[PDB]
Amino acid sequence: PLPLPPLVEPDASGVVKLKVQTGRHSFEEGSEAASAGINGAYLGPLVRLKNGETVTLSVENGMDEGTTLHWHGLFVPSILDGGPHNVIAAGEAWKPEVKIQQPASFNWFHPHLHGNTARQAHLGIAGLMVVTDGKDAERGLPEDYGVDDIPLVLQDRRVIEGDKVYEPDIMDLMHGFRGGNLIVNGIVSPEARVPASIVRLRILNGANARNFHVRLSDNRPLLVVASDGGFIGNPEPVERLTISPGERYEVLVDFSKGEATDLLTYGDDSGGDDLHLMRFVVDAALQGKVTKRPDRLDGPDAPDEKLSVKRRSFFFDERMAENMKLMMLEALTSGVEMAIAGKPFDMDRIDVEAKLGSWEIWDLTTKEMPHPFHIHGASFRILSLNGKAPPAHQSGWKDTALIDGKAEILVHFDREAVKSHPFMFHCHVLEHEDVGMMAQFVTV
Numbered sequence: 299p300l301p302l303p304p305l306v307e308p309d310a311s312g313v314v315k316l317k318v319q320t321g322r323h324s325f326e327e328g329s330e331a332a333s334a335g336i337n338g339a340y341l342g343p344l345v346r347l348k349n350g351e352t353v354t355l356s357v358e359n360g361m362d363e364g365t366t367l368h369w370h371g372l373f374v375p376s377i378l379d380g381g382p383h384n385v386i387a388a389g390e391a392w393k394p395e396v397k398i399q400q401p402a403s404f405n406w407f408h409p410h411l412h413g414n415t416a417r418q419a420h421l422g423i424a425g426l427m428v429v430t431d432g433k434d435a436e437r438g439l440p441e442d443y444g445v446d447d448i449p450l451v452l453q454d455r456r457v458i459e460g461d462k463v464y465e466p467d468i469m470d471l472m473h474g475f476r477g478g479n480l481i482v483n484g485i486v487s488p489e490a491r492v493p494a495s496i497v498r499l500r501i502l503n504g505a506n507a508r509n510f511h512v513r514l515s516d517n518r519p520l521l522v523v524a525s526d527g528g529f530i531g532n533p534e535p536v537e538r539l540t541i542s543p544g545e546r547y548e549v550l551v552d553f554s555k556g557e558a559t560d561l562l563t564y565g566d567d568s569g570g571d572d573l574h575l576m577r578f579v580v581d582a583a584l585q586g587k588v589t590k591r592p593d594r595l596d597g598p599d600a601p602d603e604k605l606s607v608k609r610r611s612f613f614f615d616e617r618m619a620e621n622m623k624l625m626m627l628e629a630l631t632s633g634v635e636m637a638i639a640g641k642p643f644d645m646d647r648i649d650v651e652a653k654l655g656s657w658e659i660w661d662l663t664t665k666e667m668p669h670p671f672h673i674h675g676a677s678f679r680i681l682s683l684n685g686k687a688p689p690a691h692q693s694g695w696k697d698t699a700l701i702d703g704k705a706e707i708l709v710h711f712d713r714e715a716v717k718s719h720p721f722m723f724h725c726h727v728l729e730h731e732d733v734g735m736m737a738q739f740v741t742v
């Protein structure tokens with residue numbers, strides 16, 4: 299059966315308790331591997347927060363090494379977010395108090411470290427974070443958690459038995475770490491039971507590097523209603539949906555005809571054979587609440603490029619000629635280096651000074667492979683992908699986007715970053731970030 303992240307809401311004191319810890323986890327019957335998680339040995343809860351409330355996010359580090367949590371998609375000033383400038387020491391706690399005021403959205407959280415992100419993420423440390431405004435019923439959206447509103451965290455694994463679970467070699471550092479065992483919510487090939495009705499799937503790619511390109515085995519449409527930053531005004535059906543690390547999409551799927559169906563992904567970025575992710579089976583005993591599809595939601599209007607006060611450009615520089623020379627591991631000591639802002643990430647260097655509340659257009663370019671861009675502490679609208687306006691499903695507010703050739707994005711710097719606590723932007727292939735494909739900004 300598909301495991302469900304436990305639902306956690308603020309307690310009588312306004313607190314959500316999150317304890318990062320090591321353990322062991324079974325991905326498949328009969329085996330177990332070393333792991334780490336939040337409030338358990340792998341993955342974490344789904345924390346549901348109401349727009350307008352104040353919550354204490356009480357994080358305890360129950361490990362023997364430092365960790366952090368980045369509130370990936372949450373709107374906070376940088377002093378309330380986690381990263382390499384404010385590591386939680388082994389055995390210690392961090393209890394930021396957040397006042398939520400942002401669009402309803404499906405967000406998440408996970409470590410964000412200097413040189414160590416890939417390992418801690420792959421071990422399994424992550425959780426989910428929904429911001430709700432209580433209006434989903436009025437939108438016509440399924441909202442019964444675990445029944446017709448189901449989170450799917452897509453990942454991959456090289457190792458499902460044993461203690462040596464994340465052992466990247468030089469090719470993994472250069473190209474990203476991938477494995478052949480696909481998992482959903484921590485299990486190989488789970489099965490979900492669903493009502494014969496419209497079901498909402500809240501899909502996160504939580505892998506180190508792998509891109510998923512998902513369809514159902516009978517090609518039924520995936521009605522995309524939201525991405526990272528919330529709803530789109532004109533939901534779009536797609537037959538196959540690309541999701542890169544760090545991206546989220548909420549989709550509606552109609553199970554009303556009662557037929558079982560498999561979720562599949564292309565096995566690579568070149569249309570390779572589909573691989574099985576999971577199965578959906580319809581349970582006739584359930585009466586599903588939502589039978590009609592929504593056509594219109596409360597999303598943003600078209601982006602306005604005239605708002606931009608500066609144009610920037612960044613190139614995802616894999617430094618292949620220099621790194622292949624090295625080839626002919628631990629990221630920090632490997633010798634491999636990459637860059638997003640000209641030179642590799644440097645903790646003491648500020649790459650960008652952005653005016654607070656301002657808009658900028660950023661040109662993003664790749665060469666050898668695609669890269670998922672993520673910015674902390676800001677939001678963006680995709681203006682173009684390879685010269686073309688984005689499809690509707692990719693047109694709303696986003697914080698993470700797969701760049702493949704050229705993109706142009708419209709960034710809004712709406713949250714404050716002080717010099718002691720810069721925000722960051724980076725590739726979300728965790729190996730690339732760990733070898734330097736990361737940069738830092740402050741607001742001015």
Ligand SMILES: [Cu+2]
Pocket residue numbers: 614668669670725726727730731735
């Ligand atoms: Cu990358």
